[PDB]
Amino acid sequence: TTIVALKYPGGVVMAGDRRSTQGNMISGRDVRKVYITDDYTATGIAGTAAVAVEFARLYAVELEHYEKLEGVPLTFAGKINRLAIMVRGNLAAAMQGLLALPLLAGYDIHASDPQSAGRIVSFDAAGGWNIEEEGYQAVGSGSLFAKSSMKKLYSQVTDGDSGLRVAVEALYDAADDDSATGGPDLVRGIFPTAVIIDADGAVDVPESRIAELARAIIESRS
Amino acid sequence: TTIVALKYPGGVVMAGDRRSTQGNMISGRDVRKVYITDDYTATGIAGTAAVAVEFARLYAVELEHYEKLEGVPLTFAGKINRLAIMVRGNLAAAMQGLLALPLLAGYDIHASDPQSAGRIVSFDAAGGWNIEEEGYQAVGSGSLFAKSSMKKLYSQVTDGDSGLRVAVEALYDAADDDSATGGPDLVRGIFPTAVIIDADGAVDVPESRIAELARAIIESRS
Amino acid sequence: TTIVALKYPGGVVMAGDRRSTQGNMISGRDVRKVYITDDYTATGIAGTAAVAVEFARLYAVELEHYEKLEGVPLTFAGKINRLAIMVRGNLAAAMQGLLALPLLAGYDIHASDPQSAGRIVSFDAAGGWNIEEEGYQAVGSGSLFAKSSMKKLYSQVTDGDSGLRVAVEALYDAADDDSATGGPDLVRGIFPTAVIIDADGAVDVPESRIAELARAIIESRS
Amino acid sequence: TTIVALKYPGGVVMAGDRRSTQGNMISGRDVRKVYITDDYTATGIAGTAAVAVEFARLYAVELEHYEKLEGVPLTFAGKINRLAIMVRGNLAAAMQGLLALPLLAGYDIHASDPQSAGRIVSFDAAGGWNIEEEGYQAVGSGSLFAKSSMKKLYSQVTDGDSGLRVAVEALYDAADDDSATGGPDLVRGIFPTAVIIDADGAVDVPESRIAELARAIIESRS
Amino acid sequence: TTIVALKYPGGVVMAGDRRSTQGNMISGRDVRKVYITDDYTATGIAGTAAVAVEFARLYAVELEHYEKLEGVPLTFAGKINRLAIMVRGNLAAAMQGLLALPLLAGYDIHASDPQSAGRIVSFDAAGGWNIEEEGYQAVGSGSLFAKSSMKKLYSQVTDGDSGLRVAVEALYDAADDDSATGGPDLVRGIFPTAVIIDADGAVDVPESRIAELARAIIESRS
Amino acid sequence: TTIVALKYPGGVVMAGDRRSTQGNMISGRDVRKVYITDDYTATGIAGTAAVAVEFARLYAVELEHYEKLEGVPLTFAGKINRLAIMVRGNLAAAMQGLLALPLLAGYDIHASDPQSAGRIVSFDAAGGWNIEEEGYQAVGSGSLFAKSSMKKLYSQVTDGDSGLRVAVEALYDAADDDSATGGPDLVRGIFPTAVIIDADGAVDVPESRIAELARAIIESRS
Amino acid sequence: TTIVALKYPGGVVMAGDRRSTQGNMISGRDVRKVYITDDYTATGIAGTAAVAVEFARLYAVELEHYEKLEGVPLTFAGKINRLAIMVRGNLAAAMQGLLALPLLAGYDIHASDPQSAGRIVSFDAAGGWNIEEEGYQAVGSGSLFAKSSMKKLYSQVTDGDSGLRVAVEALYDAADDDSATGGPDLVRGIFPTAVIIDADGAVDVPESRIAELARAIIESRS
Amino acid sequence: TTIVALKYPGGVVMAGDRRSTQGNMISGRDVRKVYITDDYTATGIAGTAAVAVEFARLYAVELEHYEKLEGVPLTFAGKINRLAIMVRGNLAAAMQGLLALPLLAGYDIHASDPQSAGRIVSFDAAGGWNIEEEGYQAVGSGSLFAKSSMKKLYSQVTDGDSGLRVAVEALYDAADDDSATGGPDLVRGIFPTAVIIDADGAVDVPESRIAELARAIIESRS
Amino acid sequence: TTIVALKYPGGVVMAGDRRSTQGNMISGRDVRKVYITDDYTATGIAGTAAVAVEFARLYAVELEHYEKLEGVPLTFAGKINRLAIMVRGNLAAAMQGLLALPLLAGYDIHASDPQSAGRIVSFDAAGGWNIEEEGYQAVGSGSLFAKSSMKKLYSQVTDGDSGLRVAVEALYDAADDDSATGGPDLVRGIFPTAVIIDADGAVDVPESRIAELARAIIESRS
């Protein structure tokens, strides 16, 4: 599994692959690992697929619950803190095996600068969180290959479209070097999922744009 | 990894994938796992790549050594016995993780019937060997998927070409269900290696024919 | 044990073998593993027979209790969630050897199109659930062989009869390749149990039709 | 695996199943576990298949080696002693999982009464041996079922044909209660192997006779 | 220990041996293992004697307590469920050596056909229960020998007396092949205990009839 | 990680590096390890980054909570005792790897002599504290190198500027001999973070001054 | 440690870093890890520094010993085999912490096409070897980052100087992501060592040229 | 650490060294290990410094708490009992490493004879205590050497000054033979701390007196 | 224990402390750890005292043995290699507990520049060696403090006198921060042992000069 997130001028984008394995045997081919937690934040969890789905559901429920109760959404720092609390509370079971590494992408409406309101927060297993300043991050088994690909490709990111292309290319490299990450499947037409968050909210990227980006990348590599 | 072998009327065919992993990280993309041990026998060893190559080299050296010393090549049962002795003598080292499981394909030149001279020999962990009468066999991590694919496809095998197509399709199925087996990689043009043994001897299949078959299979499943 | 489920145009079919063993010794020859949980959903649990029976009973009581209390049945997502909760609760005992793996087949009456209202859900050991998109799934010790048989036979599934025949054939292949799975008992007249769910509900397939299909398959492979 | 041996007036018969398994997975269907060691001695070794084959080969070589060197065959007690020496020497390997349980059927030509010259010798793990006076013996995973059915059917044994039928029925009962023993496979036409030893020597029973007896037994059970 | 049960036209019969051992030492010669739990059901518990007596005591008390509270006896499925829960609640104590395996014979008065109203229920270690359909069952250390004897003798079971004879003979075979099972003690005049359940109720068999049956069996085998 | 603290005439200065590693892999480059706990005390925690952030946050919350509840800030000894209690209460979690060792620098506003009111408190693993009398202290992996550098450089400390320069040079030496401590980053423009406490309170040192000092040190070392 | 090797039109280049750490402490700042083994081969060992040095010495002595004894140098395959045998022999001590991971760069003077005569050989822990066709390879703790950097910069490689620049940039990225690999020390004037092999042989690259390349890279990334 | 305590006619004196170590590394140079628990009682705790400080604080708080609640101080036997209870309540921590061995010096005001009112109480790990009648006692790493020094020097103890001199000389011997005990530091001017308890209460000894005593001892030993 | 070595223009100087401890107990106060191995090399071994003395004696014997046999002394590289072979051979004992880490100082009479002929060779635990280019190196338990003292004091080294003073001060700092290192004993008159090597050879530094230097350092730090 690999999830990548990167900031572009005016927003953030998070993309993830679709493969689920049980050891070496491929058990899932259309898994979705990027969830729109709320109108301005998307979360993507690597590790055990079961724990990933549970954490996404429970974190979204917590954010919605607070917003409904108090009539105002949490600040981005509050969302970060609640996610870190979930990660810390998962520590014993993570040592036991049920492990989850989240990655959070968000848009800060309360930020003074709309252009630089995109935020990427990474979490370590102990519950600590770090707000990325380099403009990109990855989690999962193929995270190092994806990060080293984005390091070289990040100078091309100038809008949402180029950012999405770079994210898809990072996932492609991660799958090219790591067998637990699924590449773009042209036989089945299964492609990485992506979420773009800007000042207008968090919207799922339709499969058509991702499909044509992946096809262009595969043609370039050939 | 996966190596398949199957008998067709008039000979035997043996195909192998190209991927080698270290964990879930892909480390080799064009590993050759099928070796022409002698003019009428090919061997294919699954497991640790180092031990696989070492075993193939030692086995070929031993067979050629006997042929030079005694002036007559070993009978097929003699070759099977030598390979089984190697596998039995590697048991202790395989208990530490340097495991190797061979699969032997041959053309018995002393068999009365030329049309049923193909032989497939499978070796289990402890050094036992069985001459397969069902006509197909597979070794490796994707061996079960390849075997179950060949079980359904074996009624289409009538000559060398259809046998090769079925072997390539079995490798495709093994790669489809198992991440440690490499599928037909159209981006780099790396395709499974194959060897066909008939009355004329054992000859490597040119990469163009296997590429054509793999492309036809991919198109059919698209 | 092996339990297969597959979608056909207009519904779903779930079939299961009849053998239960204590190690290598056959201890039961007419075990029923496929339960009709409610009028539109059936479940099949592999693993320890005690835990399978207990889980089926508890799950059916849970669904019935909700339907009576609220006057309206649970949505398919609610049923999936309750089953996943049960599996996750079992995990602690499953590590001890009371492992139960369910497979859920259902007919979603709230779907837009009744021609594709069949649903198949697989569960992992940790509790994660996956709604199958390939149209077939299997659990049990012979699940790999059954799935590799259905992969090749699924192009023939057109109606309930085709789906039932393909399911019985997949169970036959699973029993043929796995000793813990029992094939059709021609001397005793014991055959796999199947359930067909369509718009009119979930109905047990009479043993006469399954006997006819099993005899046809055996005569085909002789 | 099950091998049975029983005495009839004027000789002995030894029969064996054909299945070999890898845990729960059926890996061999036409294995031969009964060997004609020499002109008046058959041996059948249960346990690990590789070790069984190696032990049969070694024992036959040792007997023929003594016969050629000393110009006279070993006495029956000498043969029993050599087999017991092999079993006692295999003790460490059996502790390492390379276990072998032999069963020896012979015809003592030097014995006084030619109508009671048959001899069945069972070997325990430690290398002890016992000449069976009950007139029947079994080794293997299903040996208890075979012995308990032979106890009830041994009153029907009067000649070679009745003895062969009783041996095949005992193997059938072993396969009925034990999943690691293969029953008569009427689909593939694979039947238990048998060797009949009498005053004229040891001959393999042709497959047609065993097929007829197996079909009769199956129809009687239906 | 060995306890057998078998259905006959119009009821069920359940017999048990009398020997209790602490290791290889015979400590009890007249232990009673078959209990009349209520007027239409008997239970026989193998394993440790202390836990067996406690289990029978508790089960009888529980059934009687329900009958007195509610004014109607439990249905047969209810009795099976209570016994199964009693078995399942003993997993922790049985892992320390306090294993108790029950076998339940009963007469379903609420069944449609009174001739096929007998029920034999066998429980496995984890608490699973199976209603035997073959007509006989056994528990204990000699259970396999008794079952294999009953498989051959069950065609002679035509009424209550022949069923009782077949049960006693199965016990004799189990005692013959297993040293933990006690045979008929002609010196001390101790014989297996038996209970017959039919439409009129459950009655202990008098010791004289069992004595004469055992004497007939012994004089047959002499 | 490495945090240094040192007194100068009329105050105290505390500096920390910015690198966070996971093993030998650099994961963070702008970590801030020095926190202004309250108007006159700063704290800096070495060890695990998650625990460091959580400890600093909780300690600041505790000090503020007491100040608001009682209307008066804690005495310096009270703050030391609270931090020591918080360190002692983490002894269980520190053994399993969530270690956090703090260093507390403060300006004792109740001290009689303004020019000697800077206080440095070091803590040990068991929660014991020591008010440093040598005038400097360090915590973290490079603490030994930092202390042995401050030993030689402390004669040059005379005011805030010289104290800040000596702290930065000590951090430079720690990074020069330790790879878990990050030195000045003249490519990314990341420099150690410092806090200066004196009679007017605790203020973060602007990055420009630290950049000037680090460049001067680097040019002196070339 | 990180050693990179890459092929360029007309030869091969091999660069390595200079840092040596024991745990986290930097114990060496000018280590040399690329050795000119012979006139057309450079070797570079990652892992334990002592084992690396002694392996380089043993390999050079072995190659020169063969050349002196037999009057002709070893073929490239022979050199690969000797290195692989050395690694396999070390395997046992490598489990004890004395690991050595070699990387071999050579110019095949007997190759048909001298423009493609450069060879890169990688070795796994088990002693197997692979000739890299991707044109680059890396060993050491930072080998993943170096490889993922070269994957994106290999297009630039057109001559010896372009290849050398990419090699230094790959080492820079490895040191940027990994704390066990040393970046270019502009303060001490310590830079990665490099060896260039072409038709004229293997020559050490002068330190000044690598200094210029490293300074250009640092300016580029500032 | 080493703490000595000796009686002289008319009172008691207790002295302690100043070194605190972390293994072989000196972590503290002016630790105060002798505390005035109350007006006529001093205590010195050896072992872990954190536990020593916590124990002294708790013990003093408890004594003052009782004196305030009751208006009368505890008797000496009561104080001994409270200290022994505190020791015995720390056995679990002592077994994991938080050892704390106290040494009590007191002036029994309720004693009959004013000259012999000094009391020295030694405690063991289990909580047992002894009122020492030899007139001196020591705890800590250098306790044995200090004991053996006081054994020879106690004949010179006649008044308070001679007792102080003997205590300082015993500490000097303990530091001379034990490297974890800190001797008089003439360079930093740090000397052992001492408390003299007499009929006028417990008084901290001025550092100047101990400095001149230590200098005289050093001169006499030169 | 601490042995320092440093280069000055025209030679090298190696000094060592005198303390030997058995745990916390000081056993020896006048141990000599610097040995004139031969007229131009001195060696100092830290760790177990027995192993240090044995290594020094054995190494000197080896060097003189070679010189007597071949009529010419070993080159400096040969001496380094012999010492490294001894260190590597001592690895089993070092794991057992007989650790010996050597430090070698020498004068290379064959050097191009007599002023740069001073050589310092540090050996790691695995036997690998490194010629220090820093100009200073320390071995032992206080080696880090000594090295970080010389890092600051090395600019003052301009001749033999300044180098000897810096070595003595580094030993003083190591003893100041480490309790296993013996500082200057002004009472017993025991001072570190130093050896100075220049073109005329290696000569022990007289005790009086080292005493004067130590007294000056102590008075400066007072």
Numbering used by the authors:
A (entry chain V), B (entry chain W), C (entry chain P), D (entry chain c), E (entry chain Q), F (entry chain U), ...: 301 to 522
Quote from the publication.
Mycobacterium tuberculosis possesses a Pup-proteasome system analogous to the eukaryotic ubiquitin-proteasome pathway. Mpa (known as ARC in nonmycobacterial species) recognizes prokaryotic ubiquitin-like protein (Pup) that is covalently attached to proteins destined for degradation by bacterial 20S CPs. Proteasome structure is highly conserved: a 20S core particle (20S CP) is composed of four heptameric rings stacked axially to form a barrel. Similar to the carboxyl (C)-terminal “hydrophobic-Tyr-any amino acid” (HbYX) motif of PAN and the Rpts needed for the activation of 20S CPs, Mpa bears a C-terminal “Gly-Gln-Tyr-Leu” (GQYL) motif for 20S CP gate opening.
Therefore, we used the open gate 20S CP (20SOG) in this study to obtain a stable complex of Mpa–proteasome. In both high-resolution 3D maps at 3.1 to 3.3 Å, we observed a GQYL density inserted in each of the seven activation pockets in the α-rings of 20SOG CPs. The presence of seven GQYL motifs of a hexameric Mpa complex was due to the averaging effect during 3D reconstruction of the 7-fold symmetric M. tuberculosis 20S CP. Unexpectedly, we observed two binding modes of the GQYL motif in the 20SOG CPs. In the first binding mode observed in five α-subunits (α1 to α4, and α7), the penultimate Mpa Tyr608 hydrogen (H) bonds with Arg26 of α2, but the C-terminal Leu609 carboxylate does not form a salt bridge with α2 Lys52. The GQYL motif was stabilized by two additional H-bonds with the adjacent α3 subunit: between Mpa Gly606 main chain nitrogen and carbonyl oxygen and α3 Asp144 and Ser146, respectively. In the second binding mode observed in the remaining two α-subunits (α5 to α6), the penultimate Mpa Tyr608 H-bonds with α5 Glu119, and the Leu609 carboxylate forms a lateral (horizontal) salt bridge with α5 Lys52, and the GQYL motif is further stabilized by an H-bond between the main chain nitrogen of Gly606 and the neighboring (α6) Asp144. The Mpa GQYL motif inserts 2 Å deeper in the first interaction mode and 4 Å deeper in the second interaction mode than the PafE GQYL motif. We found that each of the seven α-subunits have rotated by 3° in the Mpa-bound form, leading to the H0 helix to move outward by approximately 3 Å. The H0 outward movement apparently account for the 30 Å open substrate entry pore of the Mpa-bound α-ring.
